[PDB]
Amino acid sequence: MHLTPEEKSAVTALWGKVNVDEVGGEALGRLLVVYPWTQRFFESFGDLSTPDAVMGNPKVKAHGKKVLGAFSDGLAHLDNLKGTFATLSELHCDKLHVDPENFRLWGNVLVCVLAHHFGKEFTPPVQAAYQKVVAGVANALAHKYH
Amino acid sequence: MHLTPEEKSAVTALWGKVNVDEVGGEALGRLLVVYPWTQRFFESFGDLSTPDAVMGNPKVKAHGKKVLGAFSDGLAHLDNLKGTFATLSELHCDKLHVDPENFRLWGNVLVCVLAHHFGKEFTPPVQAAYQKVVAGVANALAHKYH
Amino acid sequence: MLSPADKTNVKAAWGKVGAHAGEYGAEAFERMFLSFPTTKTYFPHFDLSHGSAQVKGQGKKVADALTNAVAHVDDMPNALSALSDLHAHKLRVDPVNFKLLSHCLLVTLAAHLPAEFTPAVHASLDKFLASVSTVLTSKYR
Amino acid sequence: MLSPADKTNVKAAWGKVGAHAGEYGAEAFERMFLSFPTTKTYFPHFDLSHGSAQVKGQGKKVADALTNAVAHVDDMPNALSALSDLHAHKLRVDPVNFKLLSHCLLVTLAAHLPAEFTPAVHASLDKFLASVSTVLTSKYR
Numbered sequence: 365m366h367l368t369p370e371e372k373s374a375v376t377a378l379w380g381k382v383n384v385d386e387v388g389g390e391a392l393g394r395l396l397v398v399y400p401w402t403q404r405f406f407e408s409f410g411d412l413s414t415p416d417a418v419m420g421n422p423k424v425k426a427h428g429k430k431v432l433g434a435f436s437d438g439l440a441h442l443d444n445l446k447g448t449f450a451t452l453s454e455l456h457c458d459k460l461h462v463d464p465e466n467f468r469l470w471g472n473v474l475v476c477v478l479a480h481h482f483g484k485e486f487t488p489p490v491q492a493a494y495q496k497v498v499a500g501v502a503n504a505l506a507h508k509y510h
Numbered sequence: 511m512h513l514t515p516e517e518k519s520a521v522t523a524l525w526g527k528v529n530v531d532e533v534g535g536e537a538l539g540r541l542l543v544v545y546p547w548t549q550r551f552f553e554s555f556g557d558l559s560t561p562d563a564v565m566g567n568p569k570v571k572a573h574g575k576k577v578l579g580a581f582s583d584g585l586a587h588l589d590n591l592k593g594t595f596a597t598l599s600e601l602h603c604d605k606l607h608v609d610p611e612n613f614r615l616w617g618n619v620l621v622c623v624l625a626h627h628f629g630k631e632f633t634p635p636v637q638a639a640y641q642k643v644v645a646g647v648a649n650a651l652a653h654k655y656h
Numbered sequence: 657m658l659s660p661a662d663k664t665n666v667k668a669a670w671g672k673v674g675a676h677a678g679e680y681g682a683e684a685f686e687r688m689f690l691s692f693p694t695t696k697t698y699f700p701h702f703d704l705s706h707g708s709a710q711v712k713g714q715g716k717k718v719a720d721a722l723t724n725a726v727a728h729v730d731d732m733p734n735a736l737s738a739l740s741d742l743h744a745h746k747l748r749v750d751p752v753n754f755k756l757l758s759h760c761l762l763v764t765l766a767a768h769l770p771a772e773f774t775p776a777v778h779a780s781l782d783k784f785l786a787s788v789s790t791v792l793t794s795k796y797r
Numbered sequence: 798m799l800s801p802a803d804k805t806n807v808k809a810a811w812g813k814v815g816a817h818a819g820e821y822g823a824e825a826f827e828r829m830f831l832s833f834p835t836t837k838t839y840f841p842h843f844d845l846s847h848g849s850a851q852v853k854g855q856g857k858k859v860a861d862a863l864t865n866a867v868a869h870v871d872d873m874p875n876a877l878s879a880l881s882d883l884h885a886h887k888l889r890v891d892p893v894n895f896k897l898l899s900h901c902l903l904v905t906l907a908a909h910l911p912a913e914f915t916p917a918v919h920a921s922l923d924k925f926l927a928s929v930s931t932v933l934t935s936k937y938r
């Protein structure tokens with residue numbers, strides 16, 4: 365992952381106007397609805413049978429927030445992504461047994477969510493820089509699978 | 511990528527009995543036949559219309575050898591894969607514009623080729639260690655795409 | 657392919673796109689080119705600047721066939737047959753690029769259709785885009 | 798799906814496997830489990846030791862449905878329909894695992910069928926395995 369300083373600050377400028385509260389659940393939620401097999405990992409969260417159910421779940425909403433927090437941590441340490449996400453990598457490989465491929469799908473949904481949210485402000489060059497960040501994060505998290 | 515010392519030596523013990531000459535073209539060749547879109551990158555090699563044509567091409571055979579050489583270089587520097595493949599990463603991203611996803615497909619064909627070649631000697635634990643090496647190599651090569 | 661509820665969501669969302677289909681396609685390419693530079697190589701003789709009429713044209717060409725696909729969502733493989741041979745046999749397009757484009761399309765829709773891009777509609781368009789990709793790469797494996 | 802030349806190659810290669818189909822399947826699982834530990838989680842109550850009768854059984858169950866698939870290679874989606882709902886709706890199997898298993902199957906075939914695993918036959922079995930996966934994951938998207 366190699367962002368220019370221009371890319372790093374734009375990413376940073378945008379994320380400031382981001383309310384992890386709502387967006388946190390929009391991303392998790394949409395991950396569950398759009399890639400249904402992921403529901404399997406969250407079976408204690410309750411009902412995720414319909415989009416409504418999922419977009420209504422308060423554990424979904426609460427967990428989402430926590431995830432985007434973790435993500436915000438990375439944005440603050442863009443040069444040390446791997447070291448930032450080492451624990452979480454270990455957790456997802458050795459406790460939850462998540463296939464690293466799903467980290468990629470996750471990065472794509474967050475990107476659609478940011479697009480939805482910021483509309484015309486999510487310009488093509490802004491998406492370009494977030495695509496890189498998102499791949500970086502997928503990679504750090506898969507790091508301790510190898 | 512994290513191989514045990516047991517994994518590193520077994521990988522090393524097996525690769526010694528490997529003739530890059532033939533196997534080099536069996537892997538490239540099979541990559542072309544099994545994932546046909548890759549032919550696009552090798553259009554100056556001549557005809558690749560049929561398996562025969564591809565498995566008969568002398569540029570295919572010659573190039574294969576070169577690739578497995580490069581690969582042997584990595585096996586000799588398993589702790590510095592990225593630094594070992596940096597130039598080649600740059601080359602495949604900036605000159606050839608190969609999608610890094612195809613590095614994964616490549617690693618899978620080499621593994622089938624080693625299986626075919628060594629038969630019963632390619633035990634499940636031996637495949638496990640080669641799967642890791644192969645992912646490591648895919649990752650080093652994709653490194654300079656990020 | 658595609659549930660009936662899905663079909664309803666596709667038919668509807670595409671209605672909202674309406675006359676912006678060609679516009680939306682072009683923006684999807686510009687996004688793709690910027691985000692995944694590897695893709696540029698499939699259009700060597702094109703001016704890929706922002707408002708290139710050449711990229712506008714490929715958008716409409718893509719948006720139109722998507723529309724044709726919506727129109728024959730029950731016979732896509734026969735509906736997209738020619739486009740399947742062209743991209744696989746003559747163009748030799750790497751399957752991963754159809755995922756790249758589809759994703760850039762979703763991003764574009766999301767940014768222009770804020771009220772209509774519910775989780776539900778997002779899932780339907782994804783399965784729709786995934787189905788089109790699958791038809792167009794069918795000739796490979 | 799699948800060219801006729803492909804079909805001929807599948808029908809033939811599977812003949813060579815013959816009575817080793819159950820044996821071959823079990824070895825494919827052992828390879829998969831070792832190579833991709835993430836997959837073990839789908840069989841929590843199993844003894845996954847080497848010669849486990851439980852893993853042997855899943856091999857035959859897989860080898861048999863593959864054989865059924867070879868037998869109805871022209872109506873797979875209707876031929877595998879029940880297995881499609883079971884893996885997607887009740888099991889919620891991650892699509893990536895079907896690629897993992899398919900690959901481990903190819904590796905196993907390659908090591909036991911040295912004269913028969915030509916580049917040509919390897920391409921045919923790959924497209925065949927890819928088609929089975931696609932049917933079994935159809936219910937997702």
Ligand code: HEM
Nearest residue numbers: 402405406430431434435452460462466467470501502505
């Ligand atoms: C960039 C992507 C991701 C990040 C940053 C991330 C991070 C986290 C964090 C911060 C935790 C909680 C750690 C703790 O409380 O100790 C967590 C847990 C978890 N993650 Fe992720 N995650 C990601 C992706 C995924 C994906 C794609 C899946 C599976 C489809 C997943 C599944 C889970 C599960 C099952 C839990 C625990 C649920 C619970 O305890 O209620 N994660 N994740």
Ligand code: HEM
Nearest residue numbers: 548551552576577580581598606608612613616647648651
């Ligand atoms: C682990 C996988 C791979 C390794 C180690 C590797 C390595 C190499 C090496 C050593 C060269 C030559 C460098 C030189 O002569 O300066 C090369 C060139 C090339 N590679 Fe790869 N490669 C890999 C994968 C791929 C894949 C999957 C594709 C595309 C489908 C590809 C396409 C090419 C092309 C088009 C050339 C140049 C052909 C020519 O000049 O005749 N490579 N590769």
Ligand code: HEM
Nearest residue numbers: 695698699717718721722739743747749753754757788789
């Ligand atoms: C759902 C996705 C897609 C659809 C519906 C689609 C459709 C089409 C159609 C209808 C044409 C024109 C046929 C003609 O003029 O005879 C075309 C051509 C073409 N497509 Fe696609 N396309 C898709 C994706 C892609 C992708 C992902 C790439 C490459 C990254 C690509 C590359 C090309 C090329 C190279 C041409 C023609 C080049 C030129 O005329 O300058 N297509 N496409």
Ligand code: HEM
Nearest residue numbers: 836839840858859862863880884888890894895898929930
């Ligand atoms: C082409 C690939 C596959 C075929 C043909 C296949 C087929 C089958 C069949 C016929 C059954 C038994 C149905 C019954 O007993 O009612 C079954 C069950 C099952 N399959 Fe698959 N399978 C495939 C792949 C996979 C993969 C990749 C996984 C998971 C990594 C998986 C996991 C399971 C589970 C969890 C069960 C039942 C658990 C148990 O009975 O203990 N399958 N499969």
Ligand SMILES: [C-]#N
Nearest residue numbers: 392427428431
């Ligand atoms: C993680 N959710």
Ligand SMILES: [C-]#N
Nearest residue numbers: 538573574577
């Ligand atoms: C590289 N071949």
Ligand SMILES: [C-]#N
Nearest residue numbers: 714715717718
């Ligand atoms: C193709 N556009």
Ligand SMILES: [C-]#N
Nearest residue numbers: 855856858859
């Ligand atoms: C499933 N075996």
